[PDB]
Amino acid sequence: GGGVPTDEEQATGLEREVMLAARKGQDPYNILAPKATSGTKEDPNLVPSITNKRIVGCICEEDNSTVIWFWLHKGEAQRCPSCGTHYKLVPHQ
Amino acid sequence: HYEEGPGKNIPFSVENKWRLLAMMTLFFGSGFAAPFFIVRHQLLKK
Amino acid sequence: FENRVAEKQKLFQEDNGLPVHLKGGATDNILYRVTMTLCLGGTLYSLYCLGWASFPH
Amino acid sequence: KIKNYQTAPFDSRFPNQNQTRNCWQNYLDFHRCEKAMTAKGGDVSVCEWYRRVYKSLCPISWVSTWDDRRAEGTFPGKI
Amino acid sequence: APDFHDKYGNAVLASGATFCVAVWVYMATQIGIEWNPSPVGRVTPKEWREQ
Amino acid sequence: TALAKPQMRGLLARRLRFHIVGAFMVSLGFATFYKFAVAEKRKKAYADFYRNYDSMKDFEEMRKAGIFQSAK
Amino acid sequence: HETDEEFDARWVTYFNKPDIDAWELRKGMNTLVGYDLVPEPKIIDAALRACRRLNDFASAVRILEVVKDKAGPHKEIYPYVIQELRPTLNELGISTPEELGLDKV
Amino acid sequence: AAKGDHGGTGARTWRFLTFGLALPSVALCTLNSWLHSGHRERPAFIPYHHLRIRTKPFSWGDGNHTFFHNPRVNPLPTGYEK
Amino acid sequence: SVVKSEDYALPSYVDRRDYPLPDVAHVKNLSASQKALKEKEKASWSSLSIDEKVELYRLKFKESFAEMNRSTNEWKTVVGAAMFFIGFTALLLIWEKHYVYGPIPHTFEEEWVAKQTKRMLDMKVAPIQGFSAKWDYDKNEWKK
Amino acid sequence: MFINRWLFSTNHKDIGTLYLLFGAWAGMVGTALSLLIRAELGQPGTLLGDDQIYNVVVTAHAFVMIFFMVMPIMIGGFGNWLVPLMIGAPDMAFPRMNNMSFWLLPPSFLLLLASSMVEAGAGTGWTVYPPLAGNLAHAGASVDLTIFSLHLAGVSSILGAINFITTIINMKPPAMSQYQTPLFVWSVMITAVLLLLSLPVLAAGITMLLTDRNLNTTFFDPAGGGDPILYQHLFWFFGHPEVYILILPGFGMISHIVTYYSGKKEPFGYMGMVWAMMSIGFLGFIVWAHHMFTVGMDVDTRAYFTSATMIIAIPTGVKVFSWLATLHGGNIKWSPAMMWALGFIFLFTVGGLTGIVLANSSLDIVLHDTYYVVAHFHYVLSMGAVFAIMGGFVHWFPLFSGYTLNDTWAKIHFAIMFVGVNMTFFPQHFLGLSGMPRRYSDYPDAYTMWNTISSMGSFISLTAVMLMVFIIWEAFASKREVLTVDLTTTNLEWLNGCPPPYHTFEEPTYVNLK
Amino acid sequence: MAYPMQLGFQDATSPIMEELLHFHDHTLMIVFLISSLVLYIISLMLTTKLTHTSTMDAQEVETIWTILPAIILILIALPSLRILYMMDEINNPSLTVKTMGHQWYWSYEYTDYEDLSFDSYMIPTSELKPGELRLLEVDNRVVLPMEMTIRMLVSSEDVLHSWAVPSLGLKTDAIPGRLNQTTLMSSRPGLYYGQCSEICGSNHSFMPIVLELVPLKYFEKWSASML
Amino acid sequence: ITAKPAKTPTSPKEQAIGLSVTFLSFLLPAGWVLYHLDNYKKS
Amino acid sequence: HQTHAYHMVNPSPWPLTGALSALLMTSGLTMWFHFNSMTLLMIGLTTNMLTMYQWWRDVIRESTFQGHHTPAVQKGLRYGMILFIISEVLFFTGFFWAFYHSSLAPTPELGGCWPPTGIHPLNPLEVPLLNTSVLLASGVSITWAHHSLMEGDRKHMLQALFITITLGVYFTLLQASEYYEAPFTISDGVYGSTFFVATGFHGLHVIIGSTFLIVCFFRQLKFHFTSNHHFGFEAAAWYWHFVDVVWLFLYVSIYWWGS
Ligand SMILES: CCCCCCCCCCCCCCCCCC(=O)OCC(COC(=O)CCCCCCCCCCCCCCCCC)OC(=O)CCCCCCCCCCCCCCCCC
Ligand code: HEA
Ligand SMILES: CCCCC/C=C\C/C=C/C/C=C\C/C=C\CCCC(=O)O[C@H](COC(=O)CCCCCCCCCCCCCCCCC)COP(=O)(O)OCCN
Ligand SMILES: CCCCCC/C=C/CCCCCCCCCC(=O)O[C@H](COC(=O)CCCCCCCCCCCCCCC)COP(=O)(O)OC[C@@H](O)CO
Ligand SMILES: CCCCCCCCCCO[C@@H]1O[C@H](CO)[C@@H](O[C@H]2O[C@H](CO)[C@@H](O)[C@H](O)[C@H]2O)[C@H](O)[C@H]1O
Ligand SMILES: Cc1csc(-c2sc3ccccc3c2O)n1
């Protein structure tokens, strides 16, 4: 027998948004860690934002304990002040 | 929404430095004074 | 029993600016006011009891 | 028998700083021996070593409390 | 432009040291505080036992 | 006329090593001073006091001075 | 790791890149002054010529200031570096901080 | 234990364990317990000093009865109440 | 010049001897003559005057290394003010001795101490190092 | 709006502010109690009364300073403010339960106040040993009100520990591993684990004391087969983890302060710092019986606890030398915060070394329950935790308030405090070695000089405390608003301005994995 | 007893207390050495304009920071534990004395042969005899034979106390329902003082201990006269 | 750290007032209690 | 507005009312123990229940009705419940420490033996064994309930959960009966002290856990739980297994080995 609702039938609010977006392979609420590009000026890391600036944390090398934090602004790609890899903001919404 | 910025993220007003002085005086002064008056209270019982 | 969760989801997602502890309706306000009155009244009574208990009888 | 008793000697059963059980054991031992020697008509004097040790070791108020409770019938140890 | 320390530094240091030494020397020697120093080299022993 | 080329690399590391060795030297020097002025001094004071110490004579002086409840 | 000569050659090459931009110039100098050394004159020379290609006179003077600062209490290092740099300073018109009065408190 | 019964551990398997093992065990222990029940002979009262402790009166009743006092089996410091 | 509160998310200027080339220029907005000075800077710097070279420096930077590293007389204010408040503390201790503390016990009277000292010497208090060791029992005096 | 924001808060910053205000007020109470202690001892004789009133003062001095000053400021205050900011989190994991952790403390404080107002107070020492704390030697409500005070403070910290552990484990950026979190975040989590494990044992211990006093149990009463020593085990099983709970957040702030004002982007030996704090927390659970070397334990037990206690010096030494290695080569900024941190390193080391002396059970026989112990823990608490608190306060005050302090006044404050604390407690080593017992209202005449100097030092520290209140007033009175802060690239908590908006990290940080 | 301006331990009266003195000297030298080294290194780190702010490798130096303290701790534990077990060594006492703690005084029992027991109260300050010590003298002293191994048994009949005599390196907690044992051997005659060392109520500071060490013959006569 | 000039500067005289008032708030109540200790003890 | 998955909670009065309820309960107990009155205590208990009801009511509103419990929020609640149970384990550990301390070294006042002279322990093979089978059986039935819920079976979920609750009530009634029938009391020395305080706190936890299961039962009746999202049930199941394991330790230590 049945009688127990499913998440597809009954999930609501933010939980449902996360569920439906994951089913499309999208991550609007930042549950996953983005995978880096090569970080050159031709192939910068693309940082989504709903505003015109967002804080980037750069782990310059694997297993570094020090994270480098800076505001990434809309416009030309900026570089991590420690290792120089490029980041470019992509506003949306 | 709530007020933001310096002097607005606290449960006490800093609009007037002299009213603030009276309030900081009452705040820290009451804490420092309390044990002495409890000493007094216990001495005055017997 | 029938599944009426959809009706509750609509009620508590209503765009009325109410906090969650008051969004059920008037009964929430009554239960809140009963709770806070007992807490604050009981606290004042405890201070009275301390005053009484602080001196010999 | 082996006299010139100065004080209770070292006892390997009780080698630590807590000596409560040493006093407790010898108090039991004396009154168990005394009870055995009284019922069968023998002489309590064979129990003397236990008497000296517990008198040396036990606080006066402990012996007196234990004595009162043996007489009242409320002593919790087995004699 | 000269700041507070350039104008008043020397006076604050001199007055503060003078005031501090003077009031602590006064408190230490002039108001009856018993420091209870060692009797060694200071106190002459006196007979104490009686009949 | 021209100035000679001074050492330009590792000045901080060289200053550190020099003074760490310095501190080690001073530490040994203090441990010797402390063994002589405190540790050995304490051993000798107690050794000298008890070498010819006479406890009965010490007691008699104390008894004659009247300090004891049990010995007049 | 790498020898002193290889370290200096890496930094000479870094500042000698013809189309080095302003960010890379600042990044190089700010990284270089973190090391336990006063940079060799040949490194400063390449850095000063990078300033010339970037039309940045003020950064060239600032580079000379930090050479003096990195020397700490060793007063003999900075006059020597300036001595070795005089041909470059004359060729490029770079006045020293002292010549500009920027060594005054 | 000697029940194979493996594979997927699902609702059906655990209902199987509930009705086939768990509740039968409870029925057996209930049986066992309701056979050794019935009052046994209360022992002679001895006013032992390590028992019936009274250092402060209880905050209920007359201050001398424990919270779940049973007159049949729980004596007072002075003995069983009649 | 003017830095603003709502600016905190933007690259800013600092004067740090371990960060000689800051992220932005000290002065971002150029006057007509300052615009021409920057144009002249694209030509040979030998053609720049001393004043123009200093002016180029002051557009890029706020303080020189000598200015930002200068010593101050603050230690005189700090040490002197600390001694004042430590001195003021003695005033509180004087008030406490005068108005709060009563007499100390009679065992601190000079004659008690003198008799107490002998009795301590009679019982040989600390005879190895601490006290009686410093009394000469033969000469009847404190050892020199 | 005011009631909603400050009584119904679900915001980690406002709640942190509430903790800081509460801890500062309690700091006044604990300070006044400490002056009453040293006034009684400032000259031979009696001043207040006999030992009951004196040791109700002594008992409350410890409770206020430990449970109401240090812990709320370090864990509730700096923790709630800094931990979410340092990991880019929008708030704590349980923001509403976070608010109850705070609001349990004023009633807990009220219960401690009540215990000293009714009957003759609880003159038991902060250890509350029976039978002195029992219902015969301390009849009445005082001890029971003390127990209930500890209950409420225990529940507050236990729930706060659950909140911090959950927040630190679960609410980091998905690319950030635990080995990419700042050392202060590490120190708070480890502290929270020690709280989670130790406080329930204390709660059990003091609940058994409650039932012994009111329900005729005999856990600690030999007449019923109990043992007063059992309570000591239960208390001190919590008791030592508590002192490491008190210092660990200090360790984390010192790391940040020394790193920042050395001009460094990172502390020396990050992983070694993590290892040492985790080793210190682990070792802190197996050494408790070094508080009981004179109760009559077997020699082998006294041999183990001697050895296990001394091992803690190895991980602690790694932290001390790493702080020194962080200073090495730095562009030293002689800020007031740096001075507090440098005073911490030296004075904590001194107090730690005297702890190693006490770890030797043979020597502890003569030093236990003497002022040598008082000298030990005041050098690690009143010159370690407080200096770390003062350094953290003056360092992060511009972040919390948006206003700057007067650095000259703050340096003056440090100098007065440094003289006062050392004049107070260094002579107490002499009193301890020469045999002055703890918890005495009066002393043999020989101990007069060092007690006199010590009490004079306590007045110097009082002047520093009064100056501190003025310095805070002056900062709010003048309203010098922060403009720029250095080293934001390695101090995330500053990157949202001063003060940060009510809601921060509504959009989380971007950290990719590569 | 303690004397004015005392810095260290009271002079040792027992061989064990002598051992503790030399062990303290050994440990205190290490304490002075490490705190001075830390203070010096602090000043060394802070007195140069030279800088090195890039990433520092930590592996090699932490071997030193870990092996050296480990050796030092062993250099402390070795003599510490030797004294610990030497304190515990089997000795054959010739006398057993019990002391019971009370609020607020000590009672003593000599029950090897006779039932000798008495109370021991502090001499009030207003009743001190000229030259007697405030808060330290008792009416009835603990008379004991010198140069003999004595077994002390310590307990209490109310709250916790602690029976301490610093001169002899003694401190044994007084716990109701428990009989704690320590050993006492005085190398010299005289008077040796101690004070209650566990908070026990209103007169915690005012229940001291006074041992009177005398030759055996005087102890025997004193014991008989005290029955 | 860099900061704006004080929006409401506190002159040396104003600081003298704030410091004096702060100290008096600590010293007067405790002084009153300690001054009257004997009135509390022998009563 | 937010682009993270975490829950910003509405400002709430229940933290304050819960903290004030703790003040009233603790001052109430002091009033009861020392001043012969129950007024404060009954007010504190009443406000405590009201706080817990409305607090957890709002959690249901925030999750089932408003949808704020994303997978990340659920993961946090998992850590919170695990950590809370751990703190409860250490609380009971102190009482087991007290029990073994007293029973491994029985003092002369007890007769130097365990069980003490004059103590007649309950037979571990009668009701204590029945209680053991009851809680163990409730662990089986609640596991059946869980799998029924995950497989979408409404009826069998309610049946298994009701059986679990009935066993919890059965245990409580059996323990209440044992308490009345026991010839020893909490005042019978350290045996009665350790017995009733340890089993009493456990009995309280049984009542707490049964209440939690009853909450889940009515929430299930109202279709709150999905086959994949039901942490309230999972938390109650973890707490119930914790209650079961504590009993097993109590049975082995106090009822069996300690007899
Ligand atoms: C530094 C200590 C911690 C911080 C405190 C700072 C405040 C300043 C105080 C500090 C200024 C003095 C610092 C060293 C004092 C040593 C005194 C001594 O002779 O101690 C002797 C022993 C007992 O030994 C004996 O039995 C020998 C008997 C000899 C008697 C000769 C009589 C001569 C009279 C001397 C009178 C001295 C009066 C001192 C009176 C002092 C009143 C305050 O006492 C003890 O064990 C005391 C236990 C100390 C445990 C903590 C050790 C911390 C060491 C840090 C130092 C490194 C930095 C230095 C450089 C320090 C630069 C800051
Ligand atoms: C912040 C609080 C705090 C801290 C950090 C400590 C740290 C230590 N404590 Fe302390 N202690 C207390 C607070 C604290 N203590 C309190 C409150 C009491 C009394 C409670 C009461 O009774 O009321 C107490 C009592 C106390 C006693 C009992 C004394 C007695 O009551 O008889 C002991 C004994 O073992 C002890 C030992 C230690 C040790 C070994 C450390 C170690 O962790 C310290 C380690 C640090 C160092 C050793 C210095 C740094 C290391 C190096 C520089 C490396 C080189 C060093 C060596 C090679 C040795 N403490
Ligand atoms: C299945 C039954 C469950 C028990 C239900 C009974 C009452 C509920 C109270 C719950 C309290 C839980 C712990 C209480 C500790 C001791 C209670 C022991 C359990 C019990 O109830 O045992 C009874 C004791 O009753 C008594 O007085 C108890 C009288 C009331 C005392 C209340 C004391 C409350 C103390 C709370 C302290 C704080 C709790 C911990 C907080 C920690 C926070 C970190 C034994 O009865 P008896 O008359 O000796 O006779 C037995 C033979 N006929
Ligand atoms: C009769 C005598 C009474 C005496 C007083 C004790 C009273 C009883 C309290 C018993 C516990 C009741 C807990 C009820 C919690 C209900 C709210 C709830 O459980 O909410 C859930 C999360 O709960 C969560 O925080 C989990 C939170 C659990 C917290 C509670 C854990 C028990 C704590 C009890 C108190 C400890 C006392 C210890 C004393 C020593 C919501 O998430 P889900 O369920 O996944 O589903 C949502 C889906 O519908 C979406 O599709
Ligand atoms: C431990 C922390 C505190 C330690 C340091 C305290 C410093 C004392 C500051 C001054 O305090 C005042 O002192 C007055 C005396 O100078 C008291 O007046 C008292 O004495 C006066 C002079 O005799 C009378 O005129 C008043 O009526 C009488 O109340 C007054 O009450 C008290 O507030
Ligand atoms: C005389 C005395 C002894 S203890 C005591 C006081 S004052 C006080 C103030 C706030 C909280 C607790 C206490 C407390 O216990 N006063």
Author numbering:
A (entry chain F): 3 to 95
B (entry chain L): 2 to 47
C (entry chain J): 1 to 57
D (entry chain H): 7 to 85
E (entry chain K): 6 to 56
F (entry chain I): 2 to 73
G (entry chain E): 5 to 109
H (entry chain G): 3 to 84
Paper quotes:
We focused on T113 hereafter as its binding site was buried within a mammalian-specific helix, COX7C. X-ray diffraction data with a resolution of 2.2 Å were obtained from a mtCcO crystal soaked with T113. The obtained complex structure showed a clear compound binding site that gave additional electron density compared with the protein, clearly found inside the mtCcO. The Fo(T113)–Fo(DMSO) differential map confirmed that this electron density did not originate from water or lipid molecules, and showed the highest difference. The binding pocket was different from the binding site for molecular oxygen or cytochrome c, the route for electron transfer pathway, proton pathway, or oxygen accessing channel, suggesting that T113 is a genuine allosteric inhibitor. The binding site of T113 on mtCcO formed a narrow tunnel surrounded by four helices in total. One of the four helices in mtCcO surrounding the allosteric pocket is the genome-encoded subunit COX7C, covering the surface as if it hid the allosteric site. The Fo(T113)–Fo(DMSO) differential map revealed several differences in the structure of mtCcO triggered by the binding of the inhibitor: the exit site of the proton pathway (Asp50, Asp51), a side chain of Ser382 of TM10 in subunit I, and hydroxyfarnesylethyl group of heme a. We found the structural change in Asp50/51 and Ser382 in the mtCcO-T113 crystal structure. We reasoned that it was caused by photoreduction during sample preparation and radiation-induced reduction for the following reasons.
